[PDB]
Amino acid sequence: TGKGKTLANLKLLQHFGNVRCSFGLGMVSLTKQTAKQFLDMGVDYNSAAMVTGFSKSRFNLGSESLDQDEVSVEYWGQTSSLSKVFPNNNAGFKNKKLLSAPILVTTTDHLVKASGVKKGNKQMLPYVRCMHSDLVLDEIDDYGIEDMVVLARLVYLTACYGNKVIISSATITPAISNIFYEAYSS
Amino acid sequence: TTTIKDCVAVTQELQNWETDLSIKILCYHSRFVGDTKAQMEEYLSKVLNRKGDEYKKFVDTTTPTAYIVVATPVVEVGRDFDFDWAIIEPSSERSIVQCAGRVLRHRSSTPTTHNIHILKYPFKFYRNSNICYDVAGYESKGYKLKSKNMLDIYKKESIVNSVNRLQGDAAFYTKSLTALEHKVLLDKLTTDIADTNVFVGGWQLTANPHEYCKWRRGTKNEDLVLTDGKWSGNVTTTKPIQSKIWRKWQGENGSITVPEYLLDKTICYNDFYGGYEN
Amino acid sequence: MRKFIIVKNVKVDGINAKSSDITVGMPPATTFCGLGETMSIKTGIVVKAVSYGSVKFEVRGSRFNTSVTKFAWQDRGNGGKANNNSPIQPKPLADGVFTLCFEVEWEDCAEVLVDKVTNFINTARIAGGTIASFNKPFVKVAKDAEELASVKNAMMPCYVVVDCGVEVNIFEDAVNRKLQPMVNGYKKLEKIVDNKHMRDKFTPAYLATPTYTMIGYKMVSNVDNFDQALWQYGENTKVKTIGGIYN
Amino acid sequence: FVENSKLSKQLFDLNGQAAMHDQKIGNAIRTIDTWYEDATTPIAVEPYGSVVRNGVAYRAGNKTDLFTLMDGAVNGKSLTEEDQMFVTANLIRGGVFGG
RNA sequence: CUUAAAGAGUCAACCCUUUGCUUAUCUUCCCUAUUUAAAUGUUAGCAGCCGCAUAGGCUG
DNA sequence: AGCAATTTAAATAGGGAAGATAAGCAAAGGGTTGACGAAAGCC
DNA sequence: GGCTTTCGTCAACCCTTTGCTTATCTTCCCT
């Protein structure tokens, strides 16, 4: 920690060319931190899309003009061609930010539904998202055991279409690193 | 510490603790109202930032003071905090490594004697001596430690880093915490398909990997909501001990997440420490 | 990867409590291993191990003497003596509510496995006792060790048998370390040359003296490893636990 | 005398009406003992000359308690009129004097 | 195919009687419950008289 | 036709008495539960 | 030539007066 892991992940993604990735992170505030790093280093909202699907009421006080912080939800971005095959032209704000994002800095639960769902059509949007985009999962050790199982299911599904999985965990256990490699290998 | 009532027990003991030290106590668990919780976060991030000396102005560093933050595993995940020292209630070894990462995270000065004091037992030993590390840990009913003494299951003096988690040991998992951790990790995330496993094949066709392997599997979790100072369910606001509280932010809106088990009794929300059993 | 079927609250009465000459009380693991191989024969589901626990168990009699059974004049040629009371050979009787858990390997649905075990148990006889009642058996699987403990805790409430081993002999340690002795198998003495008065004429027969191991009763949830409660036929003409000696 | 009563000072309320104990009165009847050693004020007639308030017994440890004078009188030791009157006063006060 | 296989414990009853737990107790002192304030919400849905009306209108 | 306010503190202490006794009877049953060996009629 | 019935044969104690174990419970997290 403290060495700039997420910046190194973006560097590794950009080494192969232009970036198309889903930064799936635990917690809302860690996604906010990675979004703020992406904003102040080089990434605008035409490429980045911070997705936290709860609409929290945590606002910044003191000075709105002198903030230079509090990464928000606008996504000027670019609507992908996949929105025409989704129901009713995808959706409003949230699913447009999901599907059409080049870089999707999101909470992870908007990506683990790609592996499948009980009832409804909630699988298709993260499925089609992870089909054409890379997957970057940071500090996977903080998740639960079943959470890590479904995250490696997501890694297997992402590798099923040739995309690249970046795992960023310092305290990795050989077991975890191995089963994530075996999911990527399958 | 491990859980919320454990945190308020440590807080209520330390507040009533007579000493010459100027203890200033904070509670940092997850059961808090929208406003109060967010306020704790921003304050803690701006006082524990030790890459510069900007914090000297967010706390009273003029007077010798012990600024103590009693927290649950919400501090060891995703927090850019830098403490001078930590006292850890043992639940898992990755908790030890992560709370080591909350001490001297921003500085580079080496400690001289000892900067982490690990407790002898988790507090669930006095409540359940059969199993005590299952809360926020990989101990469970199928993987039981033979002894719960941390002299038996951990090194008495140890340089805590990622090395013990990085190495990986499957032998002697019943009397060491690290090998207990590694055992569970290879016995649940295995190269099989099972039904709740990771290579799942044949079952993707079925609804089984989405029912028996539930993402964010938590307890029932109902949400008692504070509306403008007036609580919804069986909450009953209370008064904290006002002995050593350094900072206490008030809250009026927001919601608290209470497990259905603790819904039976009053969660007794308080401005200083959120939920407990009283 | 392990599969189990549990029959909970098996109320059985008329149990032949005479486990051996020096043990009267709970039937040993040879009895329940014999019950397991009996279903391996009638139902065809081949059983590796059985973990059995005692919910309730009372030996019929006082605290120092068992209630003997009033014998019936059933031998041939002793008519004329039939008006008097038949002589009593020692066979203590007991009642017991048990919980059984059979390690099976099965390839069909759980409903036909439950039906086969139910059809066996309806015609079974625990330790010479008529099965008075039993709950509907349920199938549970032990994929991992936490799942093994799930099966373990599904036998609640019952006191399972864990093996604690023989140090010197049976009487000494039963007083000293206070553990219970039971038949873990038998010792072969002589080959039997007369197969006329036996069940089969082709199955080889031996006179046997029961070997005993020393065991303890622990509640199934307090048992750390479920393999230390699953008894199975060992290859020493004895029975043994999968987990070995309980420590 | 009260303990767990959530009330600091009770009063003897005979059916609500304020009253004082009979022992309070009867102690004030037998406050006639002016015949102990440091005899300045009358104290209550007790086998030891004991008062709860002053924390001292005026007839203890100095061979003028009721038990030694009772043993003496019984044996034959002529009791002085004041000692005799003290022993008689404790007898009409009452109490177990055995042991 | 489980120390497998098998077995009716039956019966009967008088616990009696007797009794002295008495004795004496000082609960007692102490003291600030203090300071506020719009009841608003139309706050009333009436009295006659024009009429067959307990339909509908008028009068203040 | 619902609206009923907030904090603050709930007493320190001294005592819970010993001396006596705590019955003596008389009962408390056995009745069946025996397998080998040896004469001795009997197919 | 067994075979089944009934009668005769051979014995002799030192007892002790409940526990065995003791039940399958919430941290993160975001939706």
Task: Give short descriptive properties of this protein.
part of a larger assembly, 4 chains, C: 247 residues, alpha+beta, 11-stranded antiparallel β-sheet, globular, D: 99 residues, two-stranded antiparallel ribbon, 2 strands, elongated, DNA-binding, RNA-binding, rna binding protein/dna/rna, IMMUNE SYSTEM-RNA-DNA complex, RNA BINDING PROTEIN-DNA-RNA complex
Write the layout of secondary structure elements.
The structure is cut from a larger assembly and holds 2 copies of chain A, 1 copy of chain C (247 residues) and 1 copy of chain D (99 residues).
Chain A (H helix, E strand, L loop, with lengths): L4 H11 L5 E5 L2 H14 L6 E4 L41 H7 L3 E5 L16 H8 L2 E5 L6 H15 L5 E4 L5 H12 L1
Chain C lengths: L1 E15 L12 H14 L4 E13 L33 E12 L5 H12 L3 E2 L2 E5 L4 E5 L2 H9 L5 E5 L6 H7 L3 E12 L14 E14 L11 E4 L3 E4 L6
Antiparallel strand pairs in C: 1-3, 1-5, 1-6, 2-3, 2-7, 2-10, 4-5, 7-9, 8-9, 10-11
Chain D lengths: L12 E2 L2 E2 L3 H8 L36 H10 L5 H13 L6
Antiparallel strand pairs in D: 1-2
Helix pairs in contact in D: 2-3
Chain C binds 3 DNA and RNA strands through helix 1, strand 4, helix 3, strand 8 and strand 9.
Question: How would you describe the overall organization of this protein?
Answer:
The structure is cut from a larger assembly and holds two copies of chain A, one copy of chain C (247 residues) and one copy of chain D (99 residues). Chain A is of the alpha/beta class and 186 residues long. In chain A, 36% of the residues lie in helices and 12% in strands. Chain A has helices at 5-15, 28-41, 93-99, 124-131, 145-159, 174-185, and strands at residues 21-25, 48-51, 103-107, 134-138, 165-168. A five-stranded parallel β-sheet of chain A has the order 2-3-1-4-5, sandwiched between helices. The two termini of chain A are 30 Å apart. Chain C is of the alpha+beta class. Chain C contains four helices and eleven strands, in the order βαββαβββαβαββββ. Chain C has helices at residues 29-42, 110-121, 145-153, 170-176; strands at 2-16, 47-59, 93-104, 125-126, 129-133, 138-142, 159-163, 180-191, 206-219, 231-234, 238-241. In chain C, strands 1, 2, 3, 4, 5, 6, 7, 8, 9, 10 and 11 form an eleven-stranded antiparallel β-sheet that branches. Chain C starts with a strand and ends in a 6-residue tail after the last strand. Chain D is 31% helix and 4% strand. A two-stranded antiparallel sheet of chain D has the order 1-2. Chain D has three helices and two strands, in the order ββααα. The radius of gyration of chain D is 17 Å and the shape is elongated. Chain D is mainly α. Chain D starts with 12 loop residues before the first strand and ends in a 6-residue tail after the last helix. The structure holds three DNA and RNA strands.
